[PDB]
Design a protein around this ligand. Structure first.
Ligand SMILES: Nc1ncnc2c1ncn2[C@@H]1O[C@H](COP(=O)(O)OP(=O)(O)OC[C@H]2O[C@H](O)[C@H](O)[C@@H]2O)[C@@H](O)[C@H]1O
Ligand SMILES: [Zn+2]
Length: 285
């Protein structure tokens, strides 16, 4: 019901200030042992999916009697340069965990390992069995929202001393009254608490507890970086505030780290993370 502060004017750091901040972000990534990324709707706007509270966000346009515009369907949407840069950061061991508030399903489809991802608000391609909690990552969007029945049944077969489920499959999109999934929130909180660096990308941090998770890093002595075009709810607690397009920030960061942004060969689901791949040596700083 309460959609928060919508349509706040955008902030842009000057070119030289922006370049200096991305180099400082590279320094923090190089020096940190546990990096947790927190993503919101801002990292998918470059793929044609509107955010919620930006100048033309879903809530912003709705409040102003206008309609949000989609430049793609969720099925035809492709991961942005930022989505693919996060895949590479995890692959080389520069990303410990990823906390997302996005329901667009792009992190999973980009090939990001699900065991290092917390999808706090759901995934429109994911349906879950109401009984055994088995999740099904579908190639098309699940046609319901609000944890409603989809019409499909669980298909987990009989084992030794265990029979077939046939449980009701339901969407994972939380409605306003619904509580956050316990396992995702517990894993997101554990990772945030143990992080020495939390980086937020394209989130106004207005939703609780989701938006408060990066503060769990700061209270334990860790550092907080906020990357966003608009002001956020927790700007005062950030060690570094970067006001720019997340694709420009992430592309410059990847160049600084000597890392290439990997190719996306279509929707692919990766359940578990692998040991880190080789990465370029660290500068003296
Ligand atoms: N290319 C870009 N680069 C950097 N920042 C951007 C870009 N595009 C947009 N932004 C910023 O990105 C920010 C996006 O913030 P919000 O729109 O609130 O999305 P959320 O993920 O935090 O919303 C959380 C939940 O609230 C909802 O109810 C749903 O349940 C959501 O899951 C804005 O401040 C933009 O300025
Ligand atoms: Zn089941």
């Amino acid at each position: 019901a309460d959609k928060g502060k919508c349509g706040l004017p955008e902030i842009f750091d000057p070119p030289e200030e922006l370049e200096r901040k991305v180099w400082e972000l590279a320094r923090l990534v190089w020096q940190s042992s546990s990096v947790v990324f927190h993503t919101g709707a801002g990292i998918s706007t470059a793929s044609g999916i509107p955010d919620f509270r930006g100048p033309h966000g879903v809530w912003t346009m709705e409040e102003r009697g206008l309609a949000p515009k989609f430049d793609t369907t969720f099925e035809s949407a492709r991961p942005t340069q930022t989505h693919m840069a996060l895949v590479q950061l995890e692959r080389v061991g520069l990303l410990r965990f990823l906390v997302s508030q996005n329901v667009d399903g792009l992190h999973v489809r980009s090939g990001f390992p699900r065991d290092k991802l917390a999808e706090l608000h759901g995934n429109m391609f994911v349906e879950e069995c109401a009984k055994c909690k088995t999740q099904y990552v579908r190639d098309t969007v699940v046609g319901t929202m609000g944890l409603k029945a989809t019409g499909r049944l669980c298909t987990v077969a009989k084992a030794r001393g265990l029979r077939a489920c046939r449980g009701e499959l339901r969407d994972t999109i939380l409605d306003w009254e619904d509580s956050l999934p316990d396992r995702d929130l517990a894993l997101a909180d554990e990772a945030s608490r143990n992080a020495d660096l939390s980086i937020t990308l394209g989130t106004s941090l207005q939703i609780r507890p989701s938006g408060n998770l990066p503060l769990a890093t700061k209270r334990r002595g860790g550092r907080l970086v906020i990357v966003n075009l608009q002001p956020t709810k927790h700007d005062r607690h950030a060690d570094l505030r970067i006001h720019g397009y997340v694709d420009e920030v992430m592309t410059r960061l990847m160049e600084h780290l000597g890392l290439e942004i990997p190719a996306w060969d279509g929707p692919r689901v990766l359940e578990r993370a692998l040991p880190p791949l080789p990465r370029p040596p660290t500068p003296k700083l």
